[PDB]
């Protein structure tokens, strides 16, 4: 003689996608700060299967960055009212500019780069200068699940993002994930423990990008070594335009990557490293922001090799950018007074593949969502279903 | 203190010892507008579960005894087969077909019929 009984709080969860809020220890401000000591709960005897390729978190993070970035150019000065000579990376261009008053004009001496120039922006889109007060310094961001949900973390040292996870834990909030806008080279990302691993949506298909995660970080310095100057020309009223790697450590890393490639292409086959074949400039180049000025550096000096079975790079600057293939919107970067120096860790690669025993690998590009996937592979969102009914042979008192 | 969802991989019998841990952590200008509807959804997600708990003669947390006899067709398993050799995730999978049948039987099952007779009984 057995009867139904209602249990509340039973550990039952299902895969789900929802809106996630933010946690931050100027874009990061207004984002609910993190708890001084988070709690991580291990799920004994639990095996959960992950699919990093079909994660909704990435595409919610990606859609968050795009739409939060345009807000960073809304209260900023619009650059709609915008003869050159010198090879010369920059060109001293002169032009007539409106003053405070509509009638009067002003001649100017400015310095733009060859890539920004009529400027290239007008052919495609309107343009807005960034607010010089806000900063683009990367700071760790935690993505959190609201009540009634939870986030599962795969506590595996070596994980390609798919299949069963024998040691699962759950947290309310992801770790401090760096939103670092880098291309080709992942900068300040998560470092894999022990052996390096490789991840691609489809290994058989060459067209699918191939994400590499370092275990040994690669120190990398880039520097804009010329002391520039800023004269704030008055394009009123009120608005104002601001006018102007170790080779010893890299082969150790690569030498681990061929061992990391392992049986995926075969032990016998040779592994060749070649520069990107071409495309958009954001793909061809290790593009990233450093000190507020956007760096574009040629990585052909790192990817020239042919590995049998048994270090400075050039750099150029663009004053304006249309990141995320966003057209209609363009940002001018107001330059910074002084010399710029950065020191970051290269934490991973994005790589593509070609269509015997010849394997060609190029630096990565395309969607920036892949780089978020270099952080969100350990995570997936689940919905908590706490109501349960079962028999226990107790009857209600009457 | 095994934590939130701690006994997930444990048997049903042992996981009902740690019920109060998943129940307390069940409620736990643009841009910020995306954290608001998460708070808002959190309470309608919580009141929905407790309205049932209310339409059902429970409300009282964690455990609740019923006057619905478990017809065999729902499981046909000795309670030892269920409490001592099965997890809640497995059990929720077996009964998935009959769950909404039970949910409907609960409310009608006693309270509609149970609260009414108490009204008769509490007259005298």
């Amino acid at each position, epitope marked *: 003689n057995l009867w139904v009984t209602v249990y509340y709080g039973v550990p039952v969860w299902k895969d789900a996608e929802t809106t996630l809020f933010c946690a931050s220890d100027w874009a990061t401000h207004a984002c609910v700060p993190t708890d001084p000591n988070p709690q991580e709960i291990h799920l004994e005897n639990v095996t959960e299967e992950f699919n990093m390729w079909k994660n909704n978190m990435v595409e919610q993070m990606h859609t968050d960055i795009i739409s939060l970035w345009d807000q960073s150019l809304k209260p900023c000065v619009k650059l709609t009212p915008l003869q050159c000579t010198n090879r010369g990376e920059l060109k001293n261009c002169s032009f007539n500019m409106t003053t405070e008053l509509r009638d009067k004009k002003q001649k100017v001496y400015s310095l733009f780069y060859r890539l920004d120039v009529r400027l290239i922006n007008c052919n495609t889109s309107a343009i807005t200068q960034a607010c010089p007060k806000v900063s683009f310094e990367p700071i760790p961001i935690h993505y959190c699940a609201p009540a009634g949900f939870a986030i599962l973390k795969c506590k595996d040292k070596k994980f390609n993002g798919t*299949g069963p996870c024998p040691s699962v834990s759950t947290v309310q909030c992801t770790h401090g994930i760096k939103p670092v806008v880098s291309t080709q080279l992942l900068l300040n990302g998560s470092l894999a423990e022990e052996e390096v691993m490789i991840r691609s949506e489809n290994i058989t298909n060459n067209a699918k990008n191939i994400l590499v995660q370092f275990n040994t970080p690669v120190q990398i310095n880039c520097t804009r070594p010329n002391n520039n100057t800023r004269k704030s020309i008055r394009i009123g009223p009120g608005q104002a335009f601001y006018a102007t790697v170790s080779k010893a450590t890299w082969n150790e890393t690569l030498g681990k990557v061929v061992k990391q490639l392992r049986k995926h292409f075969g032990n016998n086959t040779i592994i060749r490293f070649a520069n990107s074949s071409g495309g958009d400039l954001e793909v061809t180049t290790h593009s990233f922001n450093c000190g507020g000025e956007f760096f574009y550096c040629n990585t052909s000096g790192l990817f020239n090799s042919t590995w049998i079975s048994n270090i400075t790079l050039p750099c150029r600057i663009k004053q304006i950018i249309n990141m995320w293939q966003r057209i209609g919107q363009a940002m001018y970067a107001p330059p910074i007074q002084g010399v710029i120096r950065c020191v970051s860790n290269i934490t991973g690669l994005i790589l593509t593949r070609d269509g015997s025993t010849t394997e060609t690998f190029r630096p990565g590009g395309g969607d920036m969502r892949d780089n978020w996937r270099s952080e969100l592979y350990k995570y997936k969102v689940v919905k908590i279903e706490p109501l349960g009914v079962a028999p226990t042979r107790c009857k209600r008192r009457v | 203190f095994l934590g939130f969802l701690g006994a997930a991989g444990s048997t049903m019998g042992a996981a009902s010892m740690t019920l109060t841990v998943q129940a307390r952590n069940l409620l736990s200008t643009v841009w910020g507008i995306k954290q608001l509807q998460a708070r808002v959804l959190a309470v309608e997600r919580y009141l929905r579960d407790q309205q049932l708990l209310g339409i059902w003669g429970c409300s009282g947390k964690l455990i609740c005894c019923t006057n619905v006899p478990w017809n065999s067709s729902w499981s046909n398993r000795n309670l030892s087969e269920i409490w001592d050799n099965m997890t809640w995730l497995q059990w929720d999978k077996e009964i998935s077909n009959y769950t909404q049948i039970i949910y409907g039987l609960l409310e009608e099952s006693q309270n509609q019929q149970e609260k009414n007779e108490q009204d008769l009984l509490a007259l005298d």
Partner: antibody
Framework: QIHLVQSGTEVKKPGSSVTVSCKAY?????????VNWVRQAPGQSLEYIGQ??????????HFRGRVLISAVDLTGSSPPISSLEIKNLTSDDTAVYFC??????????????????????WGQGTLISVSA | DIQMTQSPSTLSASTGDTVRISCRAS???????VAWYQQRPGKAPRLLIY???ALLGGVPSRFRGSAAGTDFTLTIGNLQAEDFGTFYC?????????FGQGTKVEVKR
């Protein structure tokens, strides 16, 4: 799309062994799909031989210990592949052998019940004839 | 092991007919862990129905199954030419999964 292609038809003599291959095209990984090997005797009903799920090999009690079922994940060269090896053939083993692929990513699918599952993808078939 | 006894062994019908194939198990399968398969001679079986009432993606609406206790029934209304063949019920409640004897569906003449 998922296409499962098996090895060619093979003729074998009693007491011999044999390994049948199965290329799983369209399958993303055997971490999110399980492989079940089923044989159908001539003009007969189907019979479960074994499976491999979560990289765990297993076989039915009738065929237990007599058969070895291995599989290897995806490579850049080739799609993931499973292999059904049967030792010490008898004439009662003359049957057609089928590859099975069923998605395992979702717990609630109802295709699978704690490793015991139905069969969502199938192959062309391998005729194993055992005769002296 | 579960023993699936299928019935009838052979049935005859015509296009547009509504036809019902029964399959009994030795034990009762509460979880409804039973699948149905169609196999035309020579080609590989197709998974039509899993878990009783669940249609697999791409299987026509006219295939519908019902599961109560030990008995199971596959129902094909508006019988079509493509539907003729042999049908098998398969349980997967207890290891190992077991199939039925099968049911042959021939044309009336």
């Amino acid at each position: 799309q998922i296409h499962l292609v098996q090895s060619g038809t093979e003729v074998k003599k009693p007491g011999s062994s044999v390994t049948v291959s199965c290329k799983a095209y369209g399958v993303n990984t055997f971490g999110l799909y399980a492989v079940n090997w089923v044989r159908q005797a001539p003009g007969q009903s189907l019979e479960y031989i074994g499976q491999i799920w979560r990289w765990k090999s297993s076989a039915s009690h009738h065929f237990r210990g007599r058969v070895l079922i291995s599989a290897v994940d995806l490579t850049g060269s080739s799609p993931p592949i499973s292999s059904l090896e049967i030792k010490n053939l008898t004439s009662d083993d003359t049957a057609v052998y089928f590859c099975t692929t069923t998605s395992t990513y979702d717990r609630w699918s109802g295709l699978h019940h704690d490793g015991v599952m139905a069969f969502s993808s199938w192959g062309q078939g391998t005729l194993i004839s055992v005769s002296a | 092991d579960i023993q699936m006894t299928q019935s009838p062994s052979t049935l005859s019908a015509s296009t547009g007919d509504t036809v019902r194939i029964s399959c009994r198990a030795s034990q009762s399968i509460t979880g409804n862990w039973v699948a149905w398969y169609q196999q035309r001679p020579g080609k590989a079986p197709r998974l039509l129905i899993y878990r009783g009432a669940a249609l697999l993606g791409g299987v026509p609406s006219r295939f519908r199954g019902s599961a109560a206790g030990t008995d199971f029934t596959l129902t094909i209304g508006n019988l079509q030419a493509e539907d003729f063949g042999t049908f098998y019920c398969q349980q997967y409640d207890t290891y190992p999964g077991t199939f039925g004897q099968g049911t042959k569906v021939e044309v009336k003449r």
